[PDB]
Write an enzyme that holds these catalytic residues in place. Structure first.
Site, PDB file in Angstrom:
ATOM      1  N   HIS A 186     -20.302  25.848 -30.645  1.00 57.32           N
ATOM      2  CA  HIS A 186     -19.589  26.277 -31.336  1.00 57.32           C
ATOM      3  C   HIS A 186     -17.522  25.999 -31.859  1.00 57.32           C
ATOM      4  O   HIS A 186     -17.084  26.393 -32.448  1.00 57.32           O
ATOM      5  CB  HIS A 186     -19.407  27.433 -32.286  1.00 57.32           C
ATOM      6  CG  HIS A 186     -18.757  28.962 -30.826  1.00 57.32           C
ATOM      7  ND1 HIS A 186     -20.148  29.668 -30.191  1.00 57.32           N
ATOM      8  CD2 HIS A 186     -17.844  29.538 -31.368  1.00 57.32           C
ATOM      9  CE1 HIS A 186     -18.769  30.264 -29.353  1.00 57.32           C
ATOM     10  NE2 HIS A 186     -17.564  30.477 -30.421  1.00 57.32           N
ATOM     11  N   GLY A 231     -11.079  33.731 -27.563  1.00 57.21           N
ATOM     12  CA  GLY A 231     -10.610  32.603 -26.808  1.00 57.21           C
ATOM     13  C   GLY A 231     -10.643  33.373 -26.137  1.00 57.21           C
ATOM     14  O   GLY A 231     -11.228  31.966 -24.743  1.00 57.21           O
ATOM     15  N   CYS A 282     -14.886  32.794 -25.310  1.00 55.88           N
ATOM     16  CA  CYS A 282     -16.589  31.338 -25.206  1.00 55.88           C
ATOM     17  C   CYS A 282     -15.807  30.506 -24.208  1.00 55.88           C
ATOM     18  O   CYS A 282     -14.718  29.982 -24.000  1.00 55.88           O
ATOM     19  CB  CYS A 282     -16.613  31.341 -26.704  1.00 55.88           C
ATOM     20  SG  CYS A 282     -16.241  31.961 -27.700  1.00 55.88           S
TER      21      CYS A 282
HETATM   22  C1  LIG Z   1     -16.767  33.033 -32.680  1.00 59.17           C
HETATM   23  N1  LIG Z   1     -17.796  34.193 -32.848  1.00 59.17           N
HETATM   24  C2  LIG Z   1     -19.253  34.338 -33.310  1.00 59.17           C
HETATM   25  C3  LIG Z   1     -19.637  32.892 -33.480  1.00 59.17           C
HETATM   26  C4  LIG Z   1     -20.169  32.767 -32.320  1.00 59.17           C
HETATM   27  C5  LIG Z   1     -21.292  31.670 -31.583  1.00 59.17           C
HETATM   28  C6  LIG Z   1     -21.136  30.473 -32.918  1.00 59.17           C
HETATM   29  C7  LIG Z   1     -20.611  30.901 -34.609  1.00 59.17           C
HETATM   30 CL1  LIG Z   1     -20.533  29.058 -35.759  1.00 59.17          CL
HETATM   31  C8  LIG Z   1     -19.558  32.324 -34.309  1.00 59.17           C
HETATM   32  C9  LIG Z   1     -17.717  35.163 -31.589  1.00 59.17           C
HETATM   33  O1  LIG Z   1     -18.265  35.958 -31.210  1.00 59.17           O
HETATM   34  C10 LIG Z   1     -16.594  34.419 -30.659  1.00 59.17           C
HETATM   35  N2  LIG Z   1     -16.331  35.493 -29.466  1.00 59.17           N
HETATM   36  N3  LIG Z   1     -16.752  36.045 -28.124  1.00 59.17           N
HETATM   37  N4  LIG Z   1     -16.803  36.756 -27.305  1.00 59.17           N
HETATM   38  C11 LIG Z   1     -16.056  37.705 -28.141  1.00 59.17           C
HETATM   39  C12 LIG Z   1     -14.995  38.734 -28.210  1.00 59.17           C
HETATM   40  C13 LIG Z   1     -14.083  39.454 -28.789  1.00 59.17           C
HETATM   41  C14 LIG Z   1     -14.100  38.515 -30.620  1.00 59.17           C
HETATM   42  C15 LIG Z   1     -14.728  37.169 -30.413  1.00 59.17           C
HETATM   43  C16 LIG Z   1     -15.485  37.017 -29.620  1.00 59.17           C
END
Ligand SMILES: CN(Cc1cccc(Cl)c1)C(=O)Cn1nnc2ccccc21
Ligand SMILES: CN(Cc1cccc(Cl)c1)C(=O)Cn1nnc2ccccc21
Lengths: 304, 304
Positions: A41, A143, A145
């Protein structure tokens, strides 16, 4: 003596963390040998989030669009490929800090350490369990991920988790290092059911053995039970049914303390039925399930 | 979101750990620049334990009696000196892995990470607080002496603790890196009174703010209190009296959540008087005091 929620030393993994930027998005990558692994992603934008077509989004990207930076040094990307939900960016330099490592898919109920990172920089390390429903209850912000989960067996790092998502419920989802999600999750910004979770019975029993080893004994009683009887109580209290394989894994702790596994089950049965009565066990006022039997022996023997 | 008992990444400290052997005893040492620091009780034998005469025991030792090994490489000792309860072994080689570092004496109620080590090899990392009575509730076995506690501020490691002893009560005692014990403890195998401990009020309030930030809000109420009234409750429940300096340190969390510090004190007062009613806050069934206000902001902002 003493018992803490101990993480593995994170140095070997810190040496592998890099920052990956594609377009506007920055997250973390894991640099092992001449490959950087990161969540796919990284190629999405704000509109792409509800249902990204990853194959089409990746076709618009070239090697030079993946900006990989190891601290302050820039890595040259000479190949890219998507495997399930991860991207593998081939770089022209093998990471000189690559530890001996393996990629493993952990089982639900097992534990691992997470090195939370932002912009390729480590922020902190903590220990957690993969829930029976394949979520983790971590501590992650936007951030994070690409931060990874791992275990260490002497000099070998077994990477088991890469962080991808926070579900709307505030729990976390991610993949093995081949990009396969743990659980039913998909990498899209949608509400997704995480199954019914249960408490990891074998880990609660391991932790009651850790409590006896470390001096907390008040919960020991004059009773015993059977697997069948204990499993009626486990059913009522949403605990994983105990099997002979779990009893076998608890053998070393049972031998060290001299407390038969079914006698410890009778202590756990009374704690489930009566609660703690305002008392604590190893500094906790609830029944802890994030320590495996291996973790308890490792912590109580001093393994490095 | 999510909140975990997070330790600092331990890599910078792992690079400093060595094994020190004098006679029959082996423990850990900390190698920074061309000096190895370790507990002075490395020079004791089983008879020396009740009341060692450290000056006399050290006079029988020469540089060549201190065996220092950094992983598999032997260090050459060219000087030795005792400073309070630590030995400083000057070696002929500066540690190439020496991070930017400081030696600090932490205040009671502050937190730090411990890298538990055995035979100079790191086993695990965990976060803890220096209790108001200057003990720590760690996880240490025989051979862990010389393991250190530290904090990290960007690239600087502030070492604050070196482990020396487990009191007969199972709690831990140690020194700053100048060898001064925290608390009234002495390095002898005797029963030693650790003072009356208290709960670190400002940290419990910081953790209630972390709970609100991370979605656990059930304990918020319609009440307020004053410092005076709250301190009558703190007295009854063995909590540290809250001061305006503590209220000031909680300012950032109060501004982030919009909950005035005295209103949060009224939630803490009701929790102290009524208990949790079988509910949890951030996965805990007790009031947690091992997170400072700085820790909460650091974990909730993503500092690396
Ligand atoms: C960007 N996304 C959603 C997502 C995941 C995969 C693909 C897509 Cl296209 C969208 C997240 O959930 C990223 N994220 N991971 N841990 C987090 C902790 C707090 C806030 C955000 C956080
Ligand atoms: C050797 N002593 C006592 C002592 C301390 C200082 C000087 C002398 Cl002369 C004797 C210890 O308490 C060492 N120790 N530290 N943590 C431990 C955890 C579990 C078991 C032992 C542990």
């Amino acid at each position: 003596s003493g018992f803490r929620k101990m993480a593995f030393p994170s140095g070997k993994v810190e040496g592998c963390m890099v920052q990956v930027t594609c377009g506007t998005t920055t997250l973390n990558g894991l640099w092992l040998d001449d490959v950087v692994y990161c969540p796919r992603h990284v190629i999405c934008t704000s509109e792409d989030m509800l249902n990204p077509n990853y194959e089409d989004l990746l076709i618009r990207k070239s090697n030079h669009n993946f900006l990989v930076q190891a601290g302050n040094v820039q890595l040259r990307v000479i190949g890219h490929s998507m495997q399930n939900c991860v991207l593998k960016l081939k770089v022209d330099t093998a990471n000189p800090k690559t530890p001996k490592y393996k990629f493993v898919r952990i089982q639900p109920g097992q534990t691992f350490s997470v090195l939370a990172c932002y912009n390729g920089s480590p922020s902190g390390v903590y220990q957690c369990a993969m829930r029976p429903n394949f979520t983790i209850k971590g501590s992650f912000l936007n951030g994070s991920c690409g931060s990874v989960g791992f275990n260490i067996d002497y000099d070998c790092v077994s990477f088991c988790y890469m962080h991808h998502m926070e579900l709307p419920t505030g729990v976390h989802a991610g993949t093995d290092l081949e990009g396969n999600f743990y659980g039913p999750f998909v990498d899209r910004q949608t509400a997704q059911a995480a199954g019914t979770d249960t408490t990891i019975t074998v880990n609660v029993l391991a932790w009651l053995y850790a409590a006896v080893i470390n001096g907390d004994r008040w919960f020991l009683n004059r009773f015993t039970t059977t697997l069948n009887d204990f499993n009626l109580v486990a059913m009522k209290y949403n605990y994983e049914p105990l099997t002979q394989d779990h009893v076998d894994i608890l053998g070393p702790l049972s031998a060290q303390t001299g407390i038969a596994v079914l006698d410890m089950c009778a202590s756990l049965k009374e704690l489930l039925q009566n609660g703690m009565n305002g008392r604590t066990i190893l500094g906790s006022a609830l029944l802890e399930d994030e320590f495996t039997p291996f973790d308890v022996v490792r912590q109580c023997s001093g393994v490095t």
